[PDB]
Design a binder for this molecule. Structure first.
Ligand SMILES: NC(=O)C1=CN([C@@H]2O[C@H](COP(=O)(O)OP(=O)(O)OC[C@H]3O[C@@H](n4cnc5c(N)ncnc54)[C@H](OP(=O)(O)O)[C@@H]3O)[C@@H](O)[C@H]2O)C=CC1
Ligand SMILES: COc1ccc(Sc2c(C)c3c(N)nc(N)nc3n2C)cc1
Length: 186
């Protein structure tokens, strides 16, 4: 099992969702960006695992579930089996990570990508260890009802470049945004 990572797109006021969808209109190249980063594995003959909360899962369009070419794991204490289309079900972040260390997944999983929502991100970001955050900064305020947790810059270093990630400002549908990579190790 290799790297543990978070990926998120967030607005200036730290919003990541509204009524079970994104706070901004669909940004095609940003979704493609998300798809490329979570799918691509450096170790041949392996796949990345994506871990999400239940409400994240149901937010993804049915036709795109499971996220293709990745192992899909959903977090829930209420569910008793994985949702239709999901691959795995765990009851805690600890459990999900324990699981990747079982003999089955052990040698099938490269990168693990936490893709949301707020409470999964919170726990991961505040747990000791080597962790990257891939952060798309939507450069506007947008009305939101769910929020990215605080990034402690004493611990998370913004990297000045990262291979496969554009540094310059992007824009689609008149919304400007940029990509960022943070790393801590503690
Ligand atoms: N802009 C972006 O990058 C992203 C946007 N989103 C958006 O943000 C929102 C997702 O919202 P959010 O409310 O944070 O929902 P989550 O996807 O985190 O789902 C919350 C539920 O998942 C389960 N859960 C969460 N953490 C754990 C855990 N550690 N262990 C076991 N179960 C857990 C619980 O379900 P149960 O009650 O069954 O135990 C909880 O009610 C949506 O609006 C979505 O569109 C989501 C990801 C990224
Ligand atoms: C590809 O089909 C999908 C449908 C909905 C979502 S929700 C989403 C998430 C969870 C997401 C993320 N973690 N990081 C970035 N940079 N963009 C994202 N989006 C848009 C993600 C994928």
């Amino acid at each position: 099992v290799g790297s543990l990572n978070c990926i998120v797109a967030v607005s200036q006021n730290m919003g990541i969702g509204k009524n079970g969808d994104l706070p901004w209109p669909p940004l095609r190249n940003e979704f493609r960006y998300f798809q490329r980063m979570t799918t691509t594995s450096s170790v041949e003959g392996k796949q990345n695992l994506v871990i999400m909360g239940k409400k994240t899962w149901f937010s993804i369009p049915e036709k795109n579930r499971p996220l293709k070419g990745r192992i899909n794991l959903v977090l829930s204490r209420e569910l008793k089996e994985p949702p239709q289309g999901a691959h795995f079900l765990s009851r805690s972040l600890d459990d999900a990570l324990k699981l990747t260390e079982q003999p089955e997944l052990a040698n099938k999983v490269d990168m693990v990508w936490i893709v949301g929502g707020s409470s999964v991100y919170k726990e991961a970001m505040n747990h000791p260890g080597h962790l990257k955050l891939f952060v798309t900064r939507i450069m506007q305020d947008f009305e939101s009802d769910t929020f990215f947790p605080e990034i402690d810059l004493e611990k998370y270093k913004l990297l000045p470049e990262y291979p496969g990630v554009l540094s310059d400002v992007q824009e689609e549908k008149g919304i400007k945004y940029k990509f960022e990579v943070y790393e801590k190790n503690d």
